[PDB]
Amino acid sequence: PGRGGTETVGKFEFSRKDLIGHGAFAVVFKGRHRAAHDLEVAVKCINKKNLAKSQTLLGKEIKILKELKHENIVALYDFQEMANSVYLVMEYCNGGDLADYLHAMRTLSEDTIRLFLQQIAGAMRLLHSKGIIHRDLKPQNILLSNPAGRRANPNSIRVKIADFGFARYLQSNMMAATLCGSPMYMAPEVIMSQHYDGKADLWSIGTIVYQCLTGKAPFQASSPQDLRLFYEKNKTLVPTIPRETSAPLRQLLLALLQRNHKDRMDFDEFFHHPFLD
Numbered sequence: 204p205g206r207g208g209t210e211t212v213g214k215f216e217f218s219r220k221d222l223i224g225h226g227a228f229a230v231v232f233k234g235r236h237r238a239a240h241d242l243e244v245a246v247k248c249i250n251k252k253n254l255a256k257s258q259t260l261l262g263k264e265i266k267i268l269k270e271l272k273h274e275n276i277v278a279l280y281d282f283q284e285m286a287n288s289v290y291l292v293m294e295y296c297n298g299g300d301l302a303d304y305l306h307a308m309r310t311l312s313e314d315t316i317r318l319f320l321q322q323i324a325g326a327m328r329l330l331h332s333k334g335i336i337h338r339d340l341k342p343q344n345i346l347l348s349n350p351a352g353r354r355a356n357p358n359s360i361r362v363k364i365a366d367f368g369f370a371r372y373l374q375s376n377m378m379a380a381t382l383c384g385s386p387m388y389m390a391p392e393v394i395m396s397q398h399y400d401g402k403a404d405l406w407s408i409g410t411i412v413y414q415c416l417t418g419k420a421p422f423q424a425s426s427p428q429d430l431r432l433f434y435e436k437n438k439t440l441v442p443t444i445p446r447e448t449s450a451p452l453r454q455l456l457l458a459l460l461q462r463n464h465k466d467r468m469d470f471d472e473f474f475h476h477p478f479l480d
């Protein structure tokens with residue numbers, strides 16, 4: 204309410220006044236550059252209600268993001284890690300998140316989907332070449348930003364992958380096995396407690412595309428336990444795709460949403476899929 208004075212991290216300032224994100228493991232406040240007030244930032248802070256876990260995730264996010272520079276990955280301007288606190292000063296994305304946008308628009312046209320997926324593909328090319336897997340890709344973690352003025356055209360919307368707290372480096376001859384992510388967007392091999400690799404992110408991207416198209420996640424279950432049982436019991440998974448969907452987009456969706464990671468589209472195939480051209 205009235206409590207809170209100005210906080211500073213390097214050349215940036217913020218207060219608890221303008222909350223723009225809240226989760227179990229992080230809180231995000233709008234801030235600004237101290238010498239240039241028109242330069243907006245998003246400052247991610249520990250959620251002290253889950254202090255240890257929050258501190259871990261923010262620390263991982265710094266380790267990963269300080270090594271990534273790309274338009275389609277949220278920028279890290281600066282950060283401040285200490286024994287009992289952690290702050291990240293990140294790019295302010297002025298369009299909100301993809302989850303709210305796809306819903307407000309009553310789902311997205313194929314042309315808009317292509318525009319956004321081309322950009323997501325560019326960021327994933329960098330993550331793949333750097334040997335990084337994100338592990339929590341979902342519309343809520345794809346942010347929008349439009350560089351043009353007020354009321355600018357939709358064709359100018361740029362997207363940025365955010366929230367890398369669950370990301371890790373994975374050596375190319377190894378597999379990951381940490382059960383983490385968000386159950387409705389998680390690859391079947393992850394939620395079934397198996398080893399997995401970068402192809403898990405490709406499943407999640409498939410689920411993003413599916414939700415942009417329909418407004419819903421592709422496999423509805425009554426609970427995460429029931430969803431795991433569903434994958435475990437059905438070796439053949441096929442989501443309900445609207446009949447008017449173009450054949451090339453339907454093909455891309457079905458290739459990404461393959462239950463078996465061996466059958467699923469690989470990175471090269473994704474980057475070069477004709478829907479993106």
Ligand SMILES: NCCCNc1nc(Nc2cccc(NC(=O)N3CCCC3)c2)ncc1I
Nearest residue numbers: 223224231245293294295296297298299300365
């Ligand atoms: N879901 C928000 C993610 C938070 N993280 C970031 N968010 C933005 N930009 C940004 C712009 C407009 C609106 C919002 N969200 C909000 O205002 N609310 C959401 C809950 C309360 C109200 C967020 N930029 C960079 C980051 I990192």
